[PDB]
Scaffold this active site. Sequence first.
Site, mmCIF file in Angstrom:
data_model
loop_
_atom_site.group_PDB
_atom_site.id
_atom_site.type_symbol
_atom_site.label_atom_id
_atom_site.label_comp_id
_atom_site.label_asym_id
_atom_site.label_seq_id
_atom_site.Cartn_x
_atom_site.Cartn_y
_atom_site.Cartn_z
ATOM 1 N N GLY A 31 3.243 3.164 -2.444
ATOM 2 C CA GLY A 31 2.566 1.961 -2.057
ATOM 3 C C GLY A 31 1.196 1.787 -2.917
ATOM 4 O O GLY A 31 0.978 2.202 -3.766
ATOM 5 N N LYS A 51 5.982 3.102 5.554
ATOM 6 C CA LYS A 51 4.890 3.122 4.537
ATOM 7 C C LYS A 51 3.786 4.187 5.296
ATOM 8 O O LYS A 51 3.501 3.815 6.297
ATOM 9 C CB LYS A 51 4.451 2.006 4.300
ATOM 10 C CG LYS A 51 5.248 0.836 3.924
ATOM 11 C CD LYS A 51 4.839 -0.762 3.810
ATOM 12 C CE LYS A 51 3.427 -0.575 3.110
ATOM 13 N NZ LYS A 51 2.653 -1.694 3.385
ATOM 14 N N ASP A 146 -1.215 -13.258 -3.896
ATOM 15 C CA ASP A 146 -0.626 -12.368 -4.611
ATOM 16 C C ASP A 146 0.745 -12.522 -4.847
ATOM 17 O O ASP A 146 1.506 -11.499 -4.954
ATOM 18 C CB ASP A 146 -1.233 -10.917 -4.412
ATOM 19 C CG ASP A 146 -1.012 -10.147 -5.645
ATOM 20 O OD1 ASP A 146 -1.310 -10.803 -6.696
ATOM 21 O OD2 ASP A 146 -1.343 -8.890 -5.205
#
EC number: 2.7.11.24
Length: 357
Positions: A31, A51, A146
């Site tokens: 990640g 994660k 993003d």
Amino acid sequence: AAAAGAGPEMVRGQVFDVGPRYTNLSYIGEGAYGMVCSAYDNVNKVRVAIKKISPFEHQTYCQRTLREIKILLRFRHENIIGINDIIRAPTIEQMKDVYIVQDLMETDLYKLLKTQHLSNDHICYFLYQILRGLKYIHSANVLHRDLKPSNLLLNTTCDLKICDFGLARVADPDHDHTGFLTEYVATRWYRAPEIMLNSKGYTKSIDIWSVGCILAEMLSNRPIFPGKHYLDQLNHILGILGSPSQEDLNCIINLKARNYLLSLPHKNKVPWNRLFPNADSKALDLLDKMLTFNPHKRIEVEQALAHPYLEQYYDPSDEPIAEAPFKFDMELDDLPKEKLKELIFEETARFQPGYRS
Ligand SMILES: O=c1c2cc(O)c(O)cc2oc2cc(O)cc(O)c12
């Protein structure tokens, strides 16, 4: 417990202890700052993604982690990745890592584009899903900031979910103006031209540009504007769009930015149909409208959904919006490390046993 470990080495992938609920040893990738693994969810009886987040040494990491958690917990949409569970210690004193459990996805659009040609039907469906998700995001007065192929996850049936809200902000068009060559954090190749000229990226048009770049990338399996540094990005854009018109230039009031553009040799437009000779003509019409230089003239998300290219999918009654805008702090800049950790603890409380017998 710690009774589970996942092939450590770099990053720091030593321990991966995700309570008794989640039980398998399958690493996936790295990640922003922690191992990602798949695991069997012994409750829902399906494999999930988890994660590991170890954000607590860097203020930037905490800020991005908090921002993403607050946003993802508030959003609920088919085309936005959700948080299913969050695993962390029961007290702030003991909290050192946080694990975020999400639906398991087969791949992401970056990886897919590295090796697979997309049919026009897939391009159309993927674009539809991106825009459907973005509609919801924008309806909450949130900007993703993003968007790029690695932030678009796909499952085995091509369902697409937008991820990574670490750079997101609440829209603020009244405060979007800035000087020329203002530093910017979001991924270079997907930055709109105005970022380099006079924009802080606080309006919705910033995300539409990124989507346009993604559409172009889907059409050819190559990024359309692969700038090698900050200003190179603008020259890649102008190389294809051509020089901005007098009207679009007159829109840029800042002299340094204006004069920079005036200093460039004249470039003519490269027609989309010569860049993308195999593309559907309606796709290129929509692309042209997303990759419009002037952000005020750029198509909005809802208009894009209604474009003829997407007519097979468009259905505004099945393209939900958020129940209310966000007005929460997404800047998070004036907070000491202690307050950020406390906010992350508070934001993740809903997933605790906390109150059993
Ligand atoms: O964050 C994810 C990720 C999140 C999910 O919800 C998911 O189902 C699959 C994921 O795969 C990744 C792979 C990577 O190489 C890096 C990543 O950051 C991720």
